[model samples]
Target: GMRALEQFANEFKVRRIKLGYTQTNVGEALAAVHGSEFSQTTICRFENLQLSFKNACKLKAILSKWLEEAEQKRRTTISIAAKDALERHFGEHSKPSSQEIMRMAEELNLEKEVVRVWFCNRRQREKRVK
Candidate 1:
């Protein structure tokens, strides 16, 4: 199980780069259009096999879908308003409760899971800064 996760993580990173996306680009594009949210650091950790098994599995599904969509579309962009909303929420709480995440997602017109993951990744990013 773990070996497969590692293999997929490596393959996804290679494919993401080949598609002309930096980790930041992938992270933003995902939040903007794919309806799944993550950060550049999350992508880095994933490629380096640093995330936990559960988190990696969750991300694998989303990343795989993003790859497929990106391959077909050639390019993707995100909404500035959604980006702003995420930024605003992040400013208030790096670690929001699930209910708060759900409320924010509804207010922002994004998927609840997207907001959930964003908060998770945001908290992780804050940890690294300290």
Candidate 2:
């Protein structure tokens, strides 16, 4: 019944591949990009055209906007130094208070938002392995 979403559904795969983000990669990135994490299964189904028109439209809008920064590199880009410092701090306190969080950002030259997202994602990773 729709046209452009179909084309978007089609070309999106090409772009996603060209950009080198796997469904799993895109799934993980969704938390930051879309402000909510979508499962890899959802991404796979969307790419496979398995969603209803209304649901598909919603996802299309989300996916479309996500791509804006997909190339812009606005994503949390941390260096190895910050990574190690964050890793060390994360080992001690997985959930730091806002003040400690911002304090780390100051020490690491990272945005507090970046630090916050890193801890959020890191905690998820740790929880999954538990």
Candidate 3:
């Protein structure tokens, strides 16, 4: 019923909310960064799996900003060291919970979850090993 990106997109939605951002604000942010207008409904449709590949690249670009900023906001010591630590502990597991994902994002000060998603897919591949 949903594309592979839906779960990932919804993860971005949750991260954006955790950063205290509104859909309109996110829309404006998207417009500012990528020069597109992604309305609240657009975001909702995406997170709910109603939108697919219409503007997939643009949406992905916008979500990049959310992940970046969320990471930037974490100033705690534990948050600072989490990324490598988690990677060490869970070398081949599914994508982590949204909170852990966010924590790692913060630890690395990454500009987006693209790397995290890449890591997640790698973990999935390991799980499929036979």
Each prediction's TM-score against the native?
A: 0.51, 0.52, 0.43
Give the per-residue lDDT digits (tens) of candidate 2, residues 1-130: 5788889988888788778788888888888756778898999889878988889998998898887688943344477888988999988988999999999999988888898899999888866746
For model 3, the stretches where C-alpha displacement exceeds 4 angstroms are: 1-4, 53-58, 69-130
Q: Write the per-residue lDDT of candidate 3 for residues 21-119, one digit (tens) a residue.
A: 776677777766678787788877766556556666556666766568656533122233555665674666556666777766665666446445646
Per-model CA lDDT versus the true structure: 0.78, 0.84, 0.64
Q: lDDT by residue for model 1 over 61-92, one digit each (tens)?
A: 88887788897523222268887878887888
Candidates 1 and 3 compared: the better one by TM-score is 1
* Pairs clashing within candidate 1: none
lDDT of 1: 0.78
TM-score of 2: 0.52
Clashes of 3: 0
